[PDB]
Amino acid sequence: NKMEAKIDELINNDPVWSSQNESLISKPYNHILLKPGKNFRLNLIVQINRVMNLPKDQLAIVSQIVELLHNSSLLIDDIEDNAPLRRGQTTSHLIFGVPSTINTANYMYFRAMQLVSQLTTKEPLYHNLITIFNEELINLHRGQGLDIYWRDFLPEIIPTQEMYLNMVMNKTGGLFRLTLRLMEALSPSSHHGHSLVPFINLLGIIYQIRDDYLNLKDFQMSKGFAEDITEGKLSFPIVHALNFTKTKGQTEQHNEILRILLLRTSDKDIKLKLIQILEFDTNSLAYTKNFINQLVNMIKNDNENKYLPELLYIIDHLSEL
């Protein structure tokens, strides 16, 4: 009867979980926290709040949700890309193992979800906030799924520039839109002008493309290691080169771009060969730089504020988010 008594108690209570247990499974997450970036994201949220006027406490919870989603996304991204370093340091999966890191990142997606409850007690607003959360986590995973598919099954699908931009709207725009949409739903301010969603989609596009561009340009210049080549990613410049070489009939160059991506190599000279093919042969680096400038000018020349509601500064430090 003593075992029966014991089982009886176990099953009539909530599952036992200790603060010691909590710390053990938080290791992969605690490790990525040590990296900087938190204040730059906080800074963009703060600037956007000059329009939305959420009270300090509410804004802090939006910020916590964003940090959990963002950091958990990176933990997963690094396992998905086989990345050995992030912000200059060893990637969590290489320390704690892939199993713990997947589970912990996934665990934090649900802690983020739980925080949404803390934003309001109003039932109609709550429903809306969780919908926004749900929609953008679905968008996020769709774009990421496509990015991974193209890369890992290359050359099955060679994306065009239009496909790439749609993938980024889902993958990168997800977190930017999730944050803005939560703020717009919670805003006490009557009408603070048109929605900023178009503006935030544009920031996400500039962000990803610049990210892609700098990963190669920094290596060309010195700084980095063009780890995107090692990963075989269909980045903005790679997408332009692949489509450029096809439409120009440069058969050998097109096949060599593909061969190098498929090697998943860490040879610096081989990565530099490809980078210089994009520099001199397909003019993909210059095309990309100009594309970025054009995107940034869409905001810098937005005199009638159809996009815009400090923000210029953020744009120049977008790589630091």
Added chain:
Amino acid sequence: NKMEAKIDELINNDPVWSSQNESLISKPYNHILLKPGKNFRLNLIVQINRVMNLPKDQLAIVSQIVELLHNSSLLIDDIEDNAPLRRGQTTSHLIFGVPSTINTANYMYFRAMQLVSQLTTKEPLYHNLITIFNEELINLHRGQGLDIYWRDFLPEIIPTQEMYLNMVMNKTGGLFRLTLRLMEALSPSSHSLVPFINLLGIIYQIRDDYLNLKDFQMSGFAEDITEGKLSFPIVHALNFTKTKGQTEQHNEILRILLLRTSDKDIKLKLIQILEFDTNSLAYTKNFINQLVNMIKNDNENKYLPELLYIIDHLSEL
């Protein structure tokens, strides 16, 4: 001018997503569906519905939620245990790759979350439903995290039976409870079945752990040994050897688990320690029978509200 026009259209619309895109992202998921198991789960849900009485379209959605979470959690589990097989079939990550399979399984957790908002339009109840989903997903991940931590940090921590049980309550009980709590919250009818479903969860996992070794003893690849899992019979063996001072046997068990071996002969060596030195396989068989009897001898219906047939077939949930 035209570049800008195109960017304007892009940022002013919802992100573009086609059914062809949906199909590429779904492949790792469609693959595990080829696996049977659905019929058995639906039955348990149908049987529990004789007590809950949810209309059938609502019950269909609950069933859809269970299938997404369960199948997705299995896709992730195989990656976490590095399993090559699932029901005699190649696991998805070995076909579609670890990256696509992780993203697709996580995507499906959110497709499941979205189905929840379709269970009702009543706002108070909707909130309760999402809270249930959230809580149990949190419990599920805590339990999985502890299970993995023990295995990957062995031999830093050797769990006790009580620790193993709390882990199971989180890990395995999570989905059983999530399903039942949703069904009880929606019942249009007038004692809770959670204790019973928790007990089903514990029987489920201990029997799963038991058959993994017992199927191999009688022929089963005993993959749990290769993975180095702190399974119920191994927890019993490690603590029995510790307790009895059997220092070398204690260390030989750890050594074999730490080898991550596929060698049949070495895996049998582990099973002979369990069968001849600690009698852990027998002890486990007895433990499961005692849990099952709590239900068999529940004449007052303290736990209960066919279920017995399901319990002896629980091994295919």
